[PDB]
Scaffold this active site. Sequence first.
Site, PDB file in Angstrom:
ATOM      1  N   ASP A  35       0.848  -1.188   0.000  1.00 16.68           N
ATOM      2  CA  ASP A  35       0.000   0.000   0.000  1.00 16.68           C
ATOM      3  C   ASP A  35       0.887   1.242   0.000  1.00 16.68           C
ATOM      4  O   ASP A  35       1.398   1.636   1.052  1.00 16.68           O
ATOM      5  CB  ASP A  35      -0.927  -0.021   1.211  1.00 16.68           C
ATOM      6  N   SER A 199      -0.466  15.446 -12.415  1.00 13.31           N
ATOM      7  CA  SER A 199      -0.703  15.038 -13.789  1.00 13.31           C
ATOM      8  C   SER A 199      -0.961  16.263 -14.659  1.00 13.31           C
ATOM      9  O   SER A 199      -1.538  17.262 -14.211  1.00 13.31           O
ATOM     10  CB  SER A 199      -1.890  14.074 -13.858  1.00 13.31           C
TER      11      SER A 199
END
Length: 330
Positions: A35, A199
């Site tokens: 994780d 992004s």
Amino acid sequence: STGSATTTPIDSLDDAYITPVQIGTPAQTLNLDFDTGSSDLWVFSSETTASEVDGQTIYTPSKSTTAKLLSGATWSISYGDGSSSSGDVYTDTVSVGGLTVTGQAVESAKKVSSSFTEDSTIDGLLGLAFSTLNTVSPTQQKTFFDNAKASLDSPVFTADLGYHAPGTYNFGFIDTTAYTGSITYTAVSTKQGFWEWTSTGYAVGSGTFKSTSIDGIADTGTTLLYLPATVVSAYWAQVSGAKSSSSVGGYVFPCSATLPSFTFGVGSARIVIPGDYIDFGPISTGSSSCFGGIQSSAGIGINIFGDVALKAAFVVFNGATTPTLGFASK
Ligand SMILES: NCc1ccc(C(F)(F)F)cc1
Ligand SMILES: NCc1ccc(C(F)(F)F)cc1
């Protein structure tokens, strides 16, 4: 030194991935959920309330000759989906795919939420975010990656998750045969303790690429792709019959539809998520409504590039003093 381990989807929908981890002496092998969105290594154990264990493999510190109780240390964690667990702390030897760390904090669960009890295939989590998020009190503990960093050939690990298929986590080296083209690296902010990056935009199907900054975290521990409401609305608008369902809790679409691909930007590069990756199947057995793999982050407060996005790429987690994230097509 290096390490390499195969990671396997837990079900036919790639809801999560498990990776075998050796804990203790002699080795006790548990299948952990790696994780990158959290920083605790915690396991089902012989100390877990028996009614909250349903098929999981448990860690038994009393059978490990290298286990030491960390006097007075406790831990308690709550995940963004409402999951939680808590207990005490041991130190022990932990090995991943041949890579060994001594004195790793192994957090033993005394109590787990129902979502973990019902997931018989996940024996625990191995956190790979930054150690500032570790929940051990009163003395914060380091992650497996942080403890291994000094001995690694290179301070990196890579995630190569498969679509309906096994994949690989590598520690300490970059497999140049696992991807195509070049790796595009982008800056990481550690201010919140996550692998947080920006992004550069998105495209839906064959549409025009929209240049726009999307701040989010790379999280192998989250199944879906959670993006701003404007982006998610533009995606599902191209799927005939798709709609946001309050009773279901997200966008659903007729199972007979074909989904368009989704492209996200990494600097000047483009990662394409095939439309099939966004299909998460019927909302209930026999239903003709299917659950979408791209959902709104409006209720969460942060954008999450989960498994849906990460499995379309070869992902480098560069843990140098200035950390960076690398994306390559594969
Ligand atoms: N995979 C761990 C995790 C869980 C929740 C969140 C959220 F929702 F708080 F962003 C981040 C990371
Ligand atoms: N994002 C961390 C995480 C991972 C798995 C689970 C589940 F599915 F096992 F409950 C919950 C939270």
